[PDB]
Design a protein around this nucleic acid. Sequence first.
RNA 1: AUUGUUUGAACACCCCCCAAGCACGUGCCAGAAGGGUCGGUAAAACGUGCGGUGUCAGUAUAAAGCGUCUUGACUAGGCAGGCAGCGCGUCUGAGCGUG
RNA 2: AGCUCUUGCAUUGCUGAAUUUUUUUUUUUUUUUUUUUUUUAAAAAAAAAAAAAAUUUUUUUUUUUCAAGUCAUCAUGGGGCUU
Lengths: 67, 106, 81, 176, 104, 129
Amino acid sequence: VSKLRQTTATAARAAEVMRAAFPGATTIAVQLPRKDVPTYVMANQRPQPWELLPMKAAAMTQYPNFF
Amino acid sequence: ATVGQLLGGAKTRKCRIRQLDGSPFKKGICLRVYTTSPKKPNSANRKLAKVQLSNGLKALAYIPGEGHNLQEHSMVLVSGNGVRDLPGVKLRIVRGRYDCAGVKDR
Amino acid sequence: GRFRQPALVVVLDLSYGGEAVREAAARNVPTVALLNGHSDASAVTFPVYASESHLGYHHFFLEWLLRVVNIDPKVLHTLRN
Amino acid sequence: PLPPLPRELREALYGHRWDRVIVDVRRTHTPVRGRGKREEYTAMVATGNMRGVFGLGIGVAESAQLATARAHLDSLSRLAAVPLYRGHTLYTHVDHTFHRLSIRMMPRPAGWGLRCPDLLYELCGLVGLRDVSIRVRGQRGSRFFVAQCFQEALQKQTTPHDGVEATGMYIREVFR
Amino acid sequence: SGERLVVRLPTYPAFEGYPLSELDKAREGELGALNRLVAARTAAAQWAAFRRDLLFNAWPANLRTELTRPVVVATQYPPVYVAAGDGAKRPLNEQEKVYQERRL
Amino acid sequence: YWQARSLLHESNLHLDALGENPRYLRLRRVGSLFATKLQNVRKLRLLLGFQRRGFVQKLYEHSLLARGSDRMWKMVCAMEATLPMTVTRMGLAEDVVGAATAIRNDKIYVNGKQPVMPRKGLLEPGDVV
RNA sequence: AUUGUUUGAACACCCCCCAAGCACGUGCCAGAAGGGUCGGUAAAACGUGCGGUGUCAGUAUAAAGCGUCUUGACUAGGCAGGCAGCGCGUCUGAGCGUG
RNA sequence: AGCUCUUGCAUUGCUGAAUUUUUUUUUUUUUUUUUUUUUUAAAAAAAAAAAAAAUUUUUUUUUUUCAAGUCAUCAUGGGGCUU
C-alpha cells in the first residue's frame, strides 16, 4: 500500500528543481531544449521518479547532448 | 528505451499435461484393456489402459503392479505420471482405489 | 657465493633470441633487449630502442658495458686524481 | 614415473597450514595408431593455506592415484597470493569470464556465511573466503574452468595499502 | 578478571579517506575505537536490561465487558495516569509501572 | 600457539599432509561431498537427541532473526539459550537425553514453577532455572 | 510445596544425480523409472527377507505457482559462426539531435 | 580316488597367422674448466672436446589381432561316470 501512498513525495521536491534550475518557467512543467512545448510530468498509481524530466532538462539546457 | 522492446513485454499459462486440464486427478471409465510391445531396447509387454476420462477426452494410461483386474465398463482414478517406453502416453493408474485395487501380497 | 642461477639476462638479438626473453619472463628474470620490429617483444622488461643492425652500436654498447664492468669507481677516482 | 619436489618448498609444508581438494577427475579417450583406445585420467587439485595464498594444479596420467598425486604436487608447486579483507572477504565486486563462463562475485559482511555453489564452497574454504555470495552463469558443466576462472577472478581485484605512502591521503573510517 | 569483548558487526572494505596530518593526529583506527566504545555502551545497556530481568525474579477474562477494575491512560509511553472506578485521577502504582515495563 | 585454533579450521582434524612422512603417493584427498554437512546436522541434532527437522529449523530462523553480528558465536548462542543445553551446563544429568527425560517429567523449575514453553526455550539473560 | 523410572509407528528410499547394500527369486519374462536407464541367465534399480539412510503422526505419489531459468535478457541473452539482419532504397511517424 | 568323459565360447601354459620389417642411432672412456653433499677424503653435478664402440656365424633375439588351436601334454573350474 506504500507503493500507492508514496507517489507524490518527490513531486513537491521537483518544483524547486524547476525553480532553482529555471528562474521564471512554469504537477510540474519541463522545457527540454527542443520544440517549444514544455513537457508535463504528473501523478499516477505507480509512483514516479520525479526529477527525471527536470533533471534531464537542466542537464540538456546547461550541457547540450549530455547523454 | 527502444520502443519495440517497450511493447515487446498474459500468455498461455500452459498446463504441461493437457489431458488432466490443470487438475491432478480425474476419474473415468476404461474403454479398452490392452497391452502392447514397447520401443527398443525394451521388449517386455507393458499393460496399458485407454480410458474415457472425466473431461470427455481420451488418453492412454500405464497399468502398474503385478497384474490387475480391469475389464470393460470399469472405473479408475487416473494420475499424472507418464510411461516413457512408448511415445505419447502420459498417464498412470493409481492403485488403492476402486475396481483397480492393490495386488496380492505386495 | 654458490647456486649459479641467472639474475638479469640482457638480450642483444630479439630475432634469434625471442625464446630467451620468453623463458626469462617464465623464470621471472627481468630482461634488456633491442627492438627488431618482427618478434613479439611484449615480455621485455627494459626495452632498448636499438635494432641489432649495428657493429657501431654493438661497439658503443659493449664498450660502455665493459668500461663500467671492468673498473671499480674508486679506481677511476684515483685514476682521475 | 616420479613427481618433483623442491628444497625451498620444504619450509612451507612445515610452515603454513594446508588443505587439499580434488576438483574433478575425468576420463578422456583417444583412438591411436597401432593398439587401440588410450585413455588418460585428468585430475585437477586445488591447494590453499586459508590465509590468502591459493594454488591450482592440473595433472595428466594413466591411472587415477598417479594423476591425483601429480596434480596434488603440481598445485603445491604453483602458488599465488590473494589479498582479502582480514581473511574473510574480497575488496571489490568481482566479475570475470574464462572460457565463456560468467562468474559474478560480491563481497558480503562477515558472518553472512558462504552462499555459494558446490565445489566453490570447498574452494572458498580452501583459500579462506568465509563470507562471499557468488553465482556462475554460462555453461557450468566443467569444474576445471570454474577453478581457473576463480583463480584469475581472485587475482583481478585492487589493494588499498599501496597508496598511503604516495597519495598523501590517509585511508581509514570503515563505519557503515 | 572480566570484560566484554565484542567484534563490530563486521563490514565491507570501505570507501575510506582522511587528510594526511590526521595520521600524526589520530592514534587508533576507528574499528578498534568503535570496538571499545560499542563494548562500553552495550555493556551498560545490557546490564540495565539484565538487572531488570533479574529483579522480575487477575486473568479470568470471560468478558461480558464490565468496568470493574481501574483504567490506565503510536502510543505515548510512559502511560499518562491511572483512572480509578471512583472518578479519581491518580499517578501510577509501583507494581503498575513494573508491569508496564514488562509489557514492552 | 597450539590451542585456540580457527573456529572453522575443522579440516585440519579430518585429513592432514606433511606431518605423515610415509606413503608419498596414494594420499586421500577430499572429494566434493555434501555428506559432511548432513552428518554435521546429525552432530547438531545428536546434541539434543530431538526429532531432526522442526527444532533445528525453528532455531535456525530464530538465530537469524535475533541479532546480526555473525553466525558462529551467535548461532551456538541460540543452541546455548535452549533449556536442555542449559541443564547440561548446570549438570543435572549424565547427558542431554537424560536431561530431556528430566524435563519430560517437568522436574525442572525454570522461572518459578515451570517453563511456559517446554520444547523450545529460549532462556533470555535474566531468567532463573 | 510431594515421589519412582524408559528412545515409536509408520512411510518412502537405498546404480548415478541423491544419503543408503547384500542375499535367494526370475532371466529383455514379471517388472520398475523424474532423467541416464536396469533386466538379452551369476540383477548393488524388478519378487522377498536382512541391513542401512532420510522425515516422523507423518510420509511418498500426483498437480499448480514462482525460482533454478540470463529459459523474452530493464537490471540481464543475443543475431557471418547453433536459431537470429527484412533483397535494396525513398521515407514529414515516434524517439535521439551543438562541426 | 580314478577317468583317454565333456566343455578350448569357463581356463593356465604353449603355439598358429601375416602385421615379414624395424632391430641402429645411442651411450661409455679420457681431457679441460667449474661446483653439490659430509668431520683428511669419494661420489655427484655442469660446459666443451676427442677416442671405444654396440650380441651370433648371421640367424636367433624385440614385436599388435583373431572367444584362432590344444581339457588326448600335464594341469584345472563346472558338469558326467564309477558292474
